Design a protein around this ligand. Sequence first.
Ligand SMILES: CC(=O)N[C@H]1[C@H]([C@H](O)[C@H](O)CO)O[C@@](O)(C(=O)O)C[C@@H]1O
Ligand SMILES: [Ca+2]
Ligand SMILES: [Ca+2]
Ligand SMILES: [Ca+2]
Ligand SMILES: [Ca+2]
Ligand SMILES: [Ca+2]
Ligand SMILES: [Ca+2]
Ligand SMILES: [Cl-]
Ligand SMILES: [Cl-]
Ligand SMILES: [Cl-]
Ligand SMILES: [Cl-]
Ligand SMILES: [Cl-]
Ligand SMILES: [Cl-]
Ligand SMILES: [Mg+2]
Ligand SMILES: [Mg+2]
Ligand code: NA
Lengths: 264, 264, 48, 57, 57, 281
Amino acid sequence: GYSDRVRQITLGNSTITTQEAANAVVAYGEWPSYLDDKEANPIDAPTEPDVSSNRFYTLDSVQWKSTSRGWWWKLPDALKDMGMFGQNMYYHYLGRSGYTVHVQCNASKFHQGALGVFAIPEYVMACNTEAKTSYVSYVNANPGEKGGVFDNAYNPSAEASEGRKFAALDYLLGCGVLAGNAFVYPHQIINLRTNNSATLVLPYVNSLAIDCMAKHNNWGLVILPLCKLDYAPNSSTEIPITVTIAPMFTEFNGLRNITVPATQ
Amino acid sequence: GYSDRVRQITLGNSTITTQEAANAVVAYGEWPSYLDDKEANPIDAPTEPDVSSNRFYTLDSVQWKSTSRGWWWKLPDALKDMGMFGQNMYYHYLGRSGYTVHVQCNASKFHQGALGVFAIPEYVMACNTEAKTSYVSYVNANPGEKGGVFDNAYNPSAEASEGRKFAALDYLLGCGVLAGNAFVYPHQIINLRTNNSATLVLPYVNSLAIDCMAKHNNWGLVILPLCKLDYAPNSSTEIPITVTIAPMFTEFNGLRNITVPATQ
Amino acid sequence: TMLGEILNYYTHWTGSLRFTFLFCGSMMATGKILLSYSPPGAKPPTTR
Amino acid sequence: GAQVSSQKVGAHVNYTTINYYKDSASNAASKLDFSQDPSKFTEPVKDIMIKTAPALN
Amino acid sequence: GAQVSSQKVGAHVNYTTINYYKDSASNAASKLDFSQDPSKFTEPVKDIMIKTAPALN
Amino acid sequence: PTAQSTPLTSGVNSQEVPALTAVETGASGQAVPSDVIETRHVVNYKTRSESTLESFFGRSACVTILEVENFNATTDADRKKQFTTWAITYTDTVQLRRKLEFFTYSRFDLEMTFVITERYYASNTGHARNQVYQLMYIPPGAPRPTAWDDYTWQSSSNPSVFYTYGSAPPRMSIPYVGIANAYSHFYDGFARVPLKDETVDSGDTYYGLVTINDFGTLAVRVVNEYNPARITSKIRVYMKPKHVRCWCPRPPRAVPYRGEGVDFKQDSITPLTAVENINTF
Ligand SMILES: CC(=O)N[C@H]1[C@H]([C@H](O)[C@H](O)CO)O[C@@](O)(C(=O)O)C[C@@H]1O
Ligand SMILES: [Ca+2]
Ligand SMILES: [Ca+2]
Ligand SMILES: [Ca+2]
Ligand SMILES: [Ca+2]
Ligand SMILES: [Ca+2]
Ligand SMILES: [Ca+2]
Ligand SMILES: [Cl-]
Ligand SMILES: [Cl-]
Ligand SMILES: [Cl-]
Ligand SMILES: [Cl-]
Ligand SMILES: [Cl-]
Ligand SMILES: [Cl-]
Ligand SMILES: [Mg+2]
Ligand SMILES: [Mg+2]
Ligand code: NA
């Protein structure tokens, strides 16, 4: 009766079902957990918001087209305006979180295409000016739930001031490595003939026990079309990709007034 | 060495000292506590924000003058915009809280005056029109940290629309009972010759385990000058009264999008 | 400060800092004073 | 306080180490560590996959 | 007459000392001494002060 | 411990199908030859000794070339040639950097070795006595020299090495000195949060590890006063990570670096040579 294809995930007041899964990835074989006393750093009693924040948040959907080059998000950036998770994140200097990432893309037995879904620790990307190095604005680095898109062309700016965004070049994974090697990162593939969802469970990953969520994204989420969407009756068809992410084992230190980041 | 006059209170990252206290009141002899499984009502796992919210918040100070008739606040209304307590309150349908109330008023050995400090369960007050009954706007009932003032005159409005505020008549405690009987409520007195502070520890009080904080104030805080401020060198002198309140054993149920009450 | 001078012989520091305030008004002076520490990343506080 | 350990085999025995310095940072290379768990990268799946069984049942 | 002592931990054991000279002045640094009594400077008071009690009673 | 031996196996005719899988799961292929062919028994005595992290990193790599000179300096520019300062980094060269960047995080002690070389600038200005070099490690905050003979070189607290030209390459060990529990090779973030309506510049701020990294400064001088003969020197700095741990593997750098970040160069992003046909042996 039980199947690798059929899964239920419940966190807080939120449940996901899938009937065409392909198992689930636990990044580096490690389930998220709270911070042990023997690895702790800040000494204030932490906030552990539990069910208020450790629940599935659904981002705005994106459209997969035959011409799409792919999508990226950063975490915790993508969830910074998500209910009580966002409030706990911005009221504290320090935060740590694991995640359940659930990527959703259904089609038909007549559609074809394959998405690589990668969770990348410290997903540092190239800037779009050759007048400077490491020259990216906070606003362009932290787009929130809208995330960004890859391109198949690199066109760095004439002026340094116009190039303060990522050069998200698909085949170099936006960071000067070949995309074919992205499989060294925790991943699943949504191959439309096989599965309609990817599930990745991510522990907290950093060189520290806890860090400044508003300064530092721990994970990149990359969705690359490895094989282009094709549908014989309409080559111009679009199918949605929906990203749903639950924080897990969230812990916050250094309470004060709320952080309100620059928007320009 | 230890004295009824000298006290330290620590909650979360906040500490109060006083060197001229007069013991402390525990309202109805009951310390606040979390809601037991045998008295519980909503079945969702509650948020217990602990140190993020259960800490001393200092309101805007008010000025005690020889002509002052007194001050009132409602709880949790007075704390609705206080850090993470306010955020937890408005992100949830349901909340319960106890409080430590610390009222601060120092002067000199040459000043005189006495403040009655009363914690009143269900502090329902009279409206200011005789064209209607129970006719008070949400905005006037819920002033927040600024609270309100008592008057020694009752001047109900010509038009019903102009009288949708409390008739906070001092000697009737704004509610048709004699102020001299307010001592049946948990109270202290700040008598300037004796003490410079009042401390009241309040359990949650209601006919329910948990309730809608944005709809319903559980406690009134009343400060009445029982004996007027007097200072021989300057009868027009003013001394501050400062109100500092810590939520305690806070518990919230029914998480959703944030409540944003009407401001007009 | 003595702590500051010692710290300037080192590159790294960790731990809690203690700020002790001595009131030097007359015995007849009363008052209540709020002393605050706000961990970073938000608007620096200029109001109580 | 001499350590006697196996050498790496050559074409056709043991060697002796004494640490001369009070800081471990001063020490020669760590001894060969043959530890490995490729599965944390090659098979980081929640549900066990038996090679002989279908990957998807 | 070799002394074997614990090294200061690094990124990821013991070390050996032999004194070669007849004068202790010739020796390497004294071993780490974690002794301390801040109270002789921070609290040099005749009468015990209990933190939780009033400083002046 | 050895790499895997091959067991003796014959054929199969079975509902057991180890040749098929579903890499959608995020699992790599797992099948080995004994799953899909008839195999003999082969005892494998071979080991993965030389691909342990300690073995992979167990080399002194050149990370920079510094220059210093010794001559009678009469201009500001020539006075600045009598000593040099270098912000300590592994990003001046590409080879060790690329090996480290197989990993997101690392923890290691460092062996630092130096190779010091000289040449005469000119003939017919006489000769030069054998030179002593001072290499001073200036941790962040310690005062940096503004002249080759200023007070900073007394080095009461900073570690210095005095090297005599012609002696064995000088060498010292550095502990794991990170202020985190590991070194970060990559940092997806900023040094500070820019806040709503602040007046602080957001137009010329940087991104990533360059905003947060500081391993201090190496200062080098010739200790000798000037000879009539100008001597020019190179100091090659070598790093060997030892007692190594690493976490979170990454695809290696596929295209040229163009600075301290992950940025790439428009004329150098075509690493593959096109094959004539998909069917080219
Ligand atoms: C670094 C360099 O190139 N040095 C060269 C100098 C310089 O050109 C001086 O300016 C003039 O002595 O000239 C030489 O003819 C010399 O002095 O014997 C050869 C020498 O190698
Ligand atoms: Ca909690
Ligand atoms: Ca909790
Ligand atoms: Ca005390
Ligand atoms: Ca199989
Ligand atoms: Ca076989
Ligand atoms: Ca010199
Ligand atoms: Cl957002
Ligand atoms: Cl308010
Ligand atoms: Cl040279
Ligand atoms: Cl000197
Ligand atoms: Cl560091
Ligand atoms: Cl070819
Ligand atoms: Mg949003
Ligand atoms: Mg307010
Ligand atoms: Na073997």
